[PDB]
From Swiss-Prot, chains A, B, C, D:
It comes from Bacillus subtilis (strain 168). This is Enolase. The modification Phosphotyrosine is found at Y281. The modification Phosphothreonine is found at T141. It is an enzyme of class 4 (lyase). Its main location: cytoplasm. GO terms for biological process: glycolytic process; sporulation resulting in formation of a cellular spore. Its cofactor is Mg(2+).
Amino acid sequence: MPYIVDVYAREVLDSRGNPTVEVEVYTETGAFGRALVPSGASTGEYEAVELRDGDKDRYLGKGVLTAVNNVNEIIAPELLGFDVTEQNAIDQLLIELDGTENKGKLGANAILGVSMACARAAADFLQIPLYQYLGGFNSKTLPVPMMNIVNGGEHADNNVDIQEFMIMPVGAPNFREALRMGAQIFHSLKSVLSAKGLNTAVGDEGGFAPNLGSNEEALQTIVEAIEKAGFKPGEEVKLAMDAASSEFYNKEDGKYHLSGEGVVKTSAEMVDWYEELVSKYPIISIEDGLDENDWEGHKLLTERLGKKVQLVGDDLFVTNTKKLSEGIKNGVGNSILIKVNQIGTLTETFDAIEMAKRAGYTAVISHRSGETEDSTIADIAVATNAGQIKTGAPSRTDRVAKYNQLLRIEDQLAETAQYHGINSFYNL
Amino acid sequence: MPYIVDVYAREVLDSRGNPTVEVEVYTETGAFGRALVPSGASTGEYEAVELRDGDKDRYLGKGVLTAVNNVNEIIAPELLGFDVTEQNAIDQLLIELDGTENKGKLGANAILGVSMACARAAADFLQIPLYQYLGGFNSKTLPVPMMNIVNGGEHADNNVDIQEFMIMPVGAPNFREALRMGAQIFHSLKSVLSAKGLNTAVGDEGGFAPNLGSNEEALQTIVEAIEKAGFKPGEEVKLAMDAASSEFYNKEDGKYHLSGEGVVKTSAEMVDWYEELVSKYPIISIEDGLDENDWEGHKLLTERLGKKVQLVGDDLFVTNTKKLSEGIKNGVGNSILIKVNQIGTLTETFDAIEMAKRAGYTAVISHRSGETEDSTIADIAVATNAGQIKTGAPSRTDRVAKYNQLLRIEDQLAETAQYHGINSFYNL
Amino acid sequence: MPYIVDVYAREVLDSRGNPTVEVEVYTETGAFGRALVPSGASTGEYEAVELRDGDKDRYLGKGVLTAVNNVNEIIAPELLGFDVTEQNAIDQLLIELDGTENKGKLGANAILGVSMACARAAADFLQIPLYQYLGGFNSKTLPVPMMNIVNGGEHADNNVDIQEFMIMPVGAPNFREALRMGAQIFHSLKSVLSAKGLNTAVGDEGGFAPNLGSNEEALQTIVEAIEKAGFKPGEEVKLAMDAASSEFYNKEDGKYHLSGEGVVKTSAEMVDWYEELVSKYPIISIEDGLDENDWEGHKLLTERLGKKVQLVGDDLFVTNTKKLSEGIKNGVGNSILIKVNQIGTLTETFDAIEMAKRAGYTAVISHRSGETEDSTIADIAVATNAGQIKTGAPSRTDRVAKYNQLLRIEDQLAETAQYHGINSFYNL
Amino acid sequence: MPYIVDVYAREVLDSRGNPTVEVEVYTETGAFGRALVPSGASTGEYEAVELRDGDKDRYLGKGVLTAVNNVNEIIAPELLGFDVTEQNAIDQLLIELDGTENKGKLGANAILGVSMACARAAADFLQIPLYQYLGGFNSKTLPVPMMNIVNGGEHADNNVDIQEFMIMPVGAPNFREALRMGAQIFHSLKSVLSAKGLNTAVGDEGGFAPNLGSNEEALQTIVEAIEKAGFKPGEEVKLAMDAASSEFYNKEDGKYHLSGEGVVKTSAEMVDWYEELVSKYPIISIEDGLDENDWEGHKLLTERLGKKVQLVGDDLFVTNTKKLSEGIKNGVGNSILIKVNQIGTLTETFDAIEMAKRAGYTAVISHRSGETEDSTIADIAVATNAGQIKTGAPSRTDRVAKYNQLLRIEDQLAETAQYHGINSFYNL
């Protein structure tokens, strides 16, 4: 009944028209889970690697037939007859089967697919909500969403260096209202851009990449969008940024080259820069403010800004517990971006989140550029009472599907639902 | 056990960040269906009316709280105890409850949500695939995808008059390859646009709206994109257009005013235009080539081109059987765009498709601008062996969720799955 | 089936021959949970109040007939029909029914009994282990046991001021060996005491209260016992103390009066004392080292020792989140003793543990003086991966019933079971 | 469904911090029984022997790994597929498997573990109370408890020769009230001892071992405790003693050396002594009043005291039917102490009890020094309508767990429950 009778993969498509892995797990009694894997990286020295076929004459090298094959022909035979609820034991088996640090034999994408599909089949088998299967009875807290809204750096063709600007509706009483606020501000910003005669088409995360003149103009416009939606910047809505500073960091001279602003800064000057930005604009969180190897720099930024501003490691930590414990230990950051497919199992994902919490770090549950109709991360956010989530603009179903799943979960929790707004930032 | 114990609506969000209706249905035994409604029009003198709240201070007047209440407080009580497999009866009861021609009392969004939730719950109760529940044992033919790739007219800010340009992979052996072909052509097109220094952010349907100089610069660029993707334009890939000619049609003088083409043409000239467009480019299909009321021109259009070119009525028929029949009787068009939420029930949807078939017309199952993670239309297309579907670029999950469902359907069908390619056009 | 058909209380007896509450819960389908409540305090201005009958002629005023009636005649009728897996909702309903801050109307004993019986019935309904029902899939870490071994202060009639001395087997590879180490050290200690011609009858918690001459004669004797048991003091076994310093704290003069030590010290000197005690003996943890209101001294204590020594608040926080948070904000302590019956519901218990974790504080799951055959706290400790537990000497089934449950839990966990030893102290 | 699919043992801990056997039995349909074995003897010429590992470097030689191994690797394979309800057939198989008189190959502790776990699984499988599975429909009589209260001889360090003094609340209307009486007298005695400045810590059975001056002082103090609890010595509460006279018997000179009283007595003088004690104090029962081999002596004691006082053989009979039939036949004693683990199967235990009854002897169901959270003996007492039970002071859960189980059983029997007080002594 809980025993697995079938594990099955197929190739499907992600939100950007690229192949990805989908996995189905069935028990003897017909309990069913289906999971789809978001896009990752096939290389990267500290993260689980996704396996791609590399056949240039098929999906531009991005096929995942090998990965699908791995699930059907290597992983499946080992799982037949396993108790679908032994999540930890399943994850250890997957890790062992592969036998490498970065899951590069079977593929991070094969492994996560199975890891998630079993969890979903288990929750279906026990007939309980996924967030509750994952988290136990006390999973009840809806996250504050970091909603992508304006794009820069490598994600645009404009004069903005910051890669992303986001809004966080911290002043909402519940998640349902949080979402309406995000959505209204999004439609407000669209009208503001359209008035300036700027492009309002969208990128991967459902946000805009208009041709703004500078970082601060981007910030000013967003604040304007908020006011015109009828909300208060600061009190009701904070900003969040992903600087992706590795992208303008020069490894050669150890400095930051802001083409947008037309200046070159040291790590120390970057910290002065952020401090100024934060005093002018209601920014509550800054992601990858300094290069991924600028350990000395991150230490200074955290010392300077760590108690009034969330400091999120993305490329810094790469969802890697060795990196995380190094930051914790060296007073680096106070928050980690959690990408399930960058670590490769639900078990390892939950251990990572636990380590973050215990150090007083927030764990922000994250989308990837290539997403799918899967909403598992919404359930993960609630299972761990994480408090924050980053899954994009309130546009494109690859993003909005998560938001919808959070509405479902909040509705289902009814009067037990919580939403902590500004107080979700326990790191502050 | 097949009897309905609960019908439940909630407000969720579509792929454009606008609210829409989600409906859930349960039987006594726990059979379950969930449906989401795509974005229809609140007016339009001939199409079923979507009910919007119109509250200026909530979602910019686009809330669906009234429709959601209608489901929960009016429809639900009338459905408890109903055998969930009585789709026809259920649809009749919904229509009768509303009491109006255009479904404006309860809302077409409320009604369709219930109509689809019931069918999805029924397939679940019987434990058969939805396409099979909908169409019986012989549901087996995958649709040729009409994939949006470039936008103009009201859908863009360029010098292009045609509203949308689509590719149709008529030369693929199965849907899976059809889909790969579309994806590879889409990435090729993007590479090309990027080369010309044009914008590659996407619109509502997942396609590009670059600043192209002309209707034919658009067509030429798509041909080039196809060619560079490694496929034969004409033989393996055809083009389809949605002229949306209503937009540039001048009421006062009954002539057509193309800002982009920089001329003005009579109806007879439009046909001359299409004719020449068809002679220069591998265009297999044209949608709304003339005004949604210029019936006489449509009749000339069909006379001139109906034998070798598919002529689709979207705004012309409005998924309305009474309008379709007048089309059929007057020799107008050879194809109809089928929008479930434009009519309001699965029953009426299926009756329009049947009508179309008996007249030698193709029925193209269509998305809306605002979509969801819902993938019912993919099942509807296979259920009816329609042979064609229009659900977007292969980018954005609101579109790709439908393609993925078709992959699952094809995969389940196995050796019995069909794909007719160019032979899908039995109207030609 | 998950719906509750019966909630039933009876009066039973605790390990000290005092009445307490037993609650049973059944679902329609026969899912069953039974819980027994440990001994709390009838007053205490900040802790949930246990309801005692106070009848002079029945059990010396310690009957719980009123609480039992409250369960059977007030709570039960409100719970029939409730989905037994709605722990949060159930806990909320209990709290609301009582209507008071300190649970003094229905009784914390009545409320907790129902709260735990429901969770135990729920795990039974779903047929999953209780720790898993409580904590979700990732519940897997066995606690390092803090085992009572020698008593003083109000808990003895000797010249010892410290209320209790405990051993912690930090050097064991798993819980089973941890437990063996504690047992062997306990028999060794007994052999030693017996050699000195001292008494070896046990107290409420299963430990010895021999007539020792001094705080340090106690510590030295434990070290000797460890040494003679074949283990390394410091490396493999640490010591923990419950100072219960409130007891010898002189209100009138705000100084501390140690009858046994034969001196009187200021707060600054207490810290000096602990500091020196820590320098001479392998003490890893101190509980209630200063008065339950001498917040300022606690703050000095934490300043002086918090970095390398665990500082537990028992009477200081009273398992009260509002008190814990003031501790956290004021840099007071790095650990909290968690007593389920001091707060009154599993929901509130779990929220206090979560709060503690996010601040880098350890949460020690604790017994009461009066225990039962009930072993829920062992499941709670694993459910939360707390890393530590305080449930007594390895003698007396009221204590050993919890150790045995941990052995069963470890055994069930198999290869996925963890034990972190000295690394359990993430607060250090 | 009733067939055994799994028999499983593990090492757990008893109430004194010593290893013991725990056994779990599962049927094909999930019926479940868990039994824990109380401490026994690994040697003794007429009793089943418990198997201990004797590894001096592990639990001081008291491990039971061999015994656990015997269950898992030798006993389990033979029981798979057995009808769990064939108690007699299971017990015969266990006895045969071992093949020795005293169960010393497999261990008395392995065998009893299985024997009891099957019975519990069988009662669970049939969904009936254990006492009812064991005893049939007419099991309804709650026993009078012999509650340990004051300790002497080898169980103390005082001037008392008698090993134990107990109270029996014969005047209570039911068991629930019996227990409250015991408990109040226990708390009363504690205050009395505390007033004399005597130690009130507890030993193995939960009773006190204060430094009293003589046997008769012990008796006088207990009578005082009773009066001060507000009950009548004699009418409402009788005393019971376990002399354990083998402990002061000198095999060499055939006499009894009462160091406490500072006198030496012949068997005949011991009988005069008891007679005097009984005429001064409301003693109703005397256990092992003479040495285990003093057959001639026991005959005289029984002749003298057998019709007004219960005379219990413990070491005399050692739960051995050959010893019992020898006593019955030679007019020795009128009562036998029944220890399940000293005989080794439920079948043999019930046959022993039957033989006692048929001879007009009472069978007193007994605890051991090392106990556990197991309460099977409470159910045995009720299954056989034994009328008396000896499981310790109303303190320590190792004892109180039995008392609690008796409350549960009495509550469940409701109006069919009986309690015979003084009339339980059918031997008198």
